[model samples]
Target chain A: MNFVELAKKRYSCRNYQDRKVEKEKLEKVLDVARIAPTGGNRQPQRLIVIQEKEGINKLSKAANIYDAPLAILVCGDKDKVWTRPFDGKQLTDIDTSIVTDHMMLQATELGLASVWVCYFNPDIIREEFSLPDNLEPINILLMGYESKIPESPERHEKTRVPLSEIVSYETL
Target chain B: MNFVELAKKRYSCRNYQDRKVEKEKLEKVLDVARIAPTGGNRQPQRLIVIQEKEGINKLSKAANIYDAPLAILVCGDKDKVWTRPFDGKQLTDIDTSIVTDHMMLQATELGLASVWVCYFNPDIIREEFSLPDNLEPINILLMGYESKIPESPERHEKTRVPLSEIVSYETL
Candidate 1:
């Protein structure tokens, strides 16, 4: 798909078809992410793809998003960088998200649907899957064929402040 | 450009030609980000566009990566989110990044180039821009017409750990 068309068609999908996504398609999505820029090129993030029925079920049961044919858990190494509240190297959540968004767009271009599922128990996911303690679970991406495209929801303009309102110009 | 082509052509541009981006193109890029899925639709992010020459110069001087005709600082509100840190609210950094990624892709679609710059002092940005204390600055995206397309650095397959290595399976 063309870039503009892909951007327009890309939306947050909730319902999905049961058919499995091809390995090549999934790999392409991951390949885009693998090259995504990371914090200081530390590349602290790890992407866990849950495709097997057993793994999907386990992840769904623990995280409970849906019966997604596949789920990619984007995690960051906590030991990579240090933050104020969190210890270890600041494995940038934003950096990981950039990669995830790219993956979602790639999936969209490949005729797939995906939802950025962030609602999940980090502890539950780690314990259920035996993820290392240092692996900081940041996002859960659910992907599959789309059952339907959701209508864009209304975002209030008054509440939806423009870029000019929040950002300013001045030197420190 | 096709999705793969766009992805391949997308590069971290540090230099830009002296040309102003059309307002429509800028709005299109912002619109793509506006529709991006946020955690729980919280949309806890804000985009501060520095388009005015003085404003963009201040921002560029602060970050030292603002060669583009425009600079967008992706910021996030901390109060309205659910995440691991600070009462399960959405992490501002992640929110900022997702939105910024959307903008980057949109820029690419518009035949514009951008370099994602993160190595800037948030304090300086906040002070210079009079930004709210609660809004966390995530990244500096420089957008403009490109002077040249830099060759992409080598991406090694060995450096890329596969999807299987990061994921494990279990039945629910």
Candidate 2:
């Protein structure tokens, strides 16, 4: 199917089945992430796909909220910067995010479910994953066969912040 | 097309003919974004579609990058944190990116060309767009028709880092 169809079908799956995700599906998801655009093309992001029950359990323990059967640990280098200025601050955080999004969408298109998990102790994750101190734990992602489709969540409406209010027509 | 095929076909477009994106297509992209999972599902993200030529020009100047016929200014409130700890840190940023990717893929499926532009002055953008001081700009995407697909940039195969080097099986 095309992107619109996939987007409508994609939803967060907090509750996943115990069945293991197919290896081919898993590789395709990771491959999309590998080619995702990065800040300055630094590609400083790294992913650890955890399928072993022990490893997933440990990571879940560190991030208590995540409950998927499989999870991917997405990490970035805190010391690294994209060398670009946006409001006088570095934009590496957004770079890491772009890569994560690529992975999530790929998973969704593969008929799998995922939820972006970010509430974990980076320090513990670094030590637990045996990652170097320079590598920062940016976020965690849970993926597997979901049990059900989640309801659409509420969001900021157009009336509250109209498109015109947030954009300028100065140049046009 | 499947997700893999879509990824291969999606390319950045620099030139655009005079046209306005259909409201239904735009809404379809936004609806996908609305369902994107966030940090704690707080969903602190917002999208401002610059459909008017004047609005697009202001953003193009702020970024001094590509001048597409249309642009999407994605911003989030930094001070607004979800009730849970670590909610605002990565969730909001990741959520925005997922939505952006969804839009990009959707655009490609809809036969639109898009290039994600990140090099820009956030302060100048905020002032020009009348965004609150607390709102942070994460990405500004340029969308239009492509004059040509610049020779596919050759990717490096030698410097590729193995997934195992970055991932660990046992520790902590």
Candidate 3:
């Protein structure tokens, strides 16, 4: 499929089956994410893969993983990412999200489902996952085969705001 | 081509021809961006399309757009996006970055080059663009035809850190 079709096919999936994601498919997702561009090429994203029952149970304490057989704890090293000179806005989360988006779309292409999870307890994740001071959890991309019906690719027509609503010409 | 080839085909293109991007291609990029899933589906990203010389000149004061024929100032509404309930961490930049990533990849699919720029004066962007108090510019995606040789897709093997260095299993 084309990039546009792949983009449309992806969605924030919330349900998953008990089957394991193929090793090669999982590797392909990470490979695509590893090459995701970051500002100044400061690739600060550090991913912690969780597939075992013990790790998933531990992660469940922090947030819901929807029984997905695999999860990637996408973290960013705050001290290592690029920062804006004028406003000092760190691109750590911004950079990390790009990688997450790439991984999500790549997973979709591999016939996997996922959800970009962020509503989680950072404190729990830090202590349970043994994350360092500089490393912060930005997103948790939960992946597996779908156990439920997926949202339609064409749902964006009703779900998302139109281009005129979001896009402006020359000025805002 | 597959999504992997498309992802590999995309690079942070900095050099661009003076030619303008076709109107349909620009809209196609936006159409893909419009469907980018955000945290909680807040969909708070607002875009400002700058194609004319006057707007580009105005934007040039904030950051070096490299004279790309088209630019999309990706902004996020702070009050409208999702926030982590535990820490109140707003996802404005994160959501906007996802939209920018989708747009950049879509532009690549359309044979356009782009650079995801974050080193800009947000104050100037707000004032010059007449943005409201709620809207803040997160990323500026500069797009056009490439005038320079593209980076090798294989370059990621050396340029990016090894997967083992970034990905860990079961524990960190």
Candidate 4:
């Protein structure tokens, strides 16, 4: 499907079937993320894919995302991220987030479901995964085949703030 | 095109023709962003669309991106974002980045070109546009017809860090 159709098809898939995601599909998802744009092309992001039961169990305890065949721990290196020299605005989190977005959409296009998760204990993740000091975990993506695709909650509907309210014509 | 083909077609379009983007096309791009997922569905992002010559001129002076007839200032509200209580990781920037990514991809699918810009001075933007204190600009997306689509930099090639280096199976 086209990009917009893919975006519409993607949602926070919380009900996943207990099935293994195809290796080829997972690689395609990761490849899309690898090509995602980042500030100054500083590829500071690292993705750790976890499919073993033990690791997924550990992650499940930290967050309530339903059982999925795969999860990717998206991390970024603070030292390597680009920062605006003028205002010191760090680009690590933003860069990593863009990567996560691409992966999620790619998963949908491949007939998979996923969600962007951050309601986990980062410290627990750091110790459980033996993450280094520089590799700070930004978000965890749970991926798998959906048992059933639930309708997006009312709040997530396209009923965003009006264009006039959020969008200004010439000046803000 | 399929999502992967659409993604491959997308590049950071630096050279833009001095042509105006159609209002219908711009709305479609913005619609894709409106449906983009945000952490907790807070949807704290605000898009400031600049089509006026004077406003685009002011932004061009701050950032070196070639002139595009249209620009979208992606901003996020600080107080409305979701933050992880454990480590105080804010989701505002990440959410906004996801929005920007969707917009960029949608632009590509619409036969347009765009570049994600953060090198501009935010302070100047705040003052020049009279932005509110709560709204923080995350990235400036310059969009228009491409004068010439250059090949992506070699560094951005799909030949990223080997899967062994970045992707650890089962564990980090």
Candidate 5:
């Protein structure tokens, strides 16, 4: 498929079918994450795949998206990430985001659907999953076969700020 | 093209031809950015397309990526981004990274190459471009036709951590 169409076709999938994603397909999605670019190539991000019913139930408590077959909890190691010298801004979350984005696109290409969930309770996740001290959960990507791809809401198209408003020529 | 092939074909293109990117192609890349998902659908990201010779020259001083005919300075509006209520972690940079990733993949599918440059002096960019205070530059995507696609270094494949280390079945 064309790249633009791929981007447009990808949506924040909420409803998911009960079918399980094949191991090969899941590996392909993770492969995309592996190749994603990170600042200084530190590769500080880690992913925990939750496919068991008990784990998905626990995850659903944090993010109540429909019963997806799997969820990839994207995490970053704070101590291992690159930081800006000037302001000391941490690049861990940004790098993790890049990886998650790539994985999401890969999932789309594989006829899977996903929702990027960030409003979840990280404290609950860390305690429940026994994550390491340095590992911080940034986003949860819920993935599975969609029950049905909903039509794009009118607001979806209209919400985009005009290209003129967002893109400046030489200077802003 | 298949998304996996597209992803594998994409590399950190450091060398570029001197030819300019067609306006239509550039627009198509930006269109992918416009549709990229953001937390809460808060489209806080803005892209500054730098195609002018003087601006590209100034950018080249900071990042010595071979003379790509265009650069997209990905910026985020600090006040408009979503923040995790618990830890107060801002999502602006992450959101901007997601947008940049989509644009980079789009560029690759369009038969173009790009390198994501985050090490550039943002102060210089802000001062030179006369950017607003609210808009913070997160990443600079140097894009154009590649002079040659370099082979992936052996270390590139070896550097990736084993899947067992980065991914877990139920919990980490």
Candidate 6:
């Protein structure tokens, strides 16, 4: 499928099955993230791939990742992220999310279900995984097989605000 | 090709050809962005689609978009972006960048070249567009045909850090 089809085909899979995500698929997902574009090519994204049972359980303390068997913690290096000299606005969150977004879509294409999760306690994550001070948890990508049918691709018709409202021509 | 190939095939095209992006293709591009997932699906992303000569000229005062015929200013609604009260980190930057990244990949799939720009003067953009305080500009996506041969997909071998360096199994 084309990118648009791929985008439409991909949906947030919250209720994942009990089965484990394959190793090959997991590697493919991580590989795509490694190659993701970062501002000024500053690769500040670091991943904590948790597939072990104990690790998954520890992750549950921070967020509800609904039983998928695989969880990836995408972290941004505050010391490494490029900052704009003009505004001092750090590019950490944006850069790391681009990595997370790519991995989410890659998982979808590999016939795996996934969810883009940011509603988690970063402090808990740091304590749970012993994350360094420089590494800030940005997103928790939960991936595996869905237990049932996901929200359909055509649901955008109702779910999304109309283009006219979000987009303006040469003006805002 | 799989998503990996697509990710590798895509590159930042700096020198755009002097050609207007097709109307149908432009709509397709925007459609994908419209469907991109946002925090809580809030859909706070707003697009200032500047393709007209006058508007593009005005945009030039903020950032150099090269010779591209279409430039989209992806703005996030400060009023609508979901904020994590625990840490007080807003999801606007990450959410909007996800929208921008999805558009970048979609552009590559459609036989187009593009660039993701964050190094722009937001103050100038605000003044130039007469933007409201709630509409914070997050990114500028420049799309068009490349003037010459662009970088190859294999360039990632040298450009990106290795998977071993970025990925870890259940540990920091």
Two-chain DockQ for model 1: 0.38
TM-score of chain B of each: 0.83, 0.79, 0.97, 0.90, 0.91, 0.96
What would the per-residue lDDT of candidate 5 be over residues A1-172, giving only the tens digit for each residue?
A: 5877778778888889999999999999988788777888788898988999878888877767688898999999988899877668778878999999989989988888888988888888888888889999998988998798554634446867776766778777
Q: Give per-residue CA lDDT, model 1, range B133-164, as digits (tens).
A: 77776778888987875645354344445545
Candidate 3: regions farther than 4 A off? none
Which regions in candidate 2 have their CA more than 4 angstroms from the true location? Answer: A65-67, A79-81, A86-88, A147-172, B17-24, B79-90, B150-172
Alpha-carbon shift of residue B84 in model 4 (angstroms)? 1.5
| Order of models, best lDDT first | 3, 6, 5, 4, 1, 2
Candidates in order, TM-scores: namely: 0.83, 0.83, 0.98, 0.93, 0.93, 0.98
Most DockQ-accurate candidate: 3
CAPRI-wise, candidate 6 is high
In model 1, the number of clashes is 15
Give the per-residue lDDT digits (tens) of candidate 6, residues A102-134. 999999899998888898988999998998899
The two-chain DockQ for each candidate, comma-separated, is 0.38, 0.38, 0.87, 0.68, 0.70, 0.86
For candidate 2, lDDT tens digit of each residue in A28-61?
8877665666666566776777888678777866
* Candidate 3: tens digits of C-alpha lDDT, residues A19-88: 9999999999999878888888888999998999889998899998888899999999988899888978
Total clashes in model 4, counting residue pairs 3 or more apart in sequence or in different chains: 0
lDDT of 3 by residue, B58-160 (tens): 8999999998999999999988999888999999988999899999989988999889999999898888999999998999999999898998878888788
Q: Which sections of candidate 6 miss by over 4 Å? A: none
* lDDT by residue (tens digit), candidate 2, B39-66: 6545566678787766766776787645
Number of clashing residue pairs in every model?
Answer: 15, 7, 0, 0, 0, 0
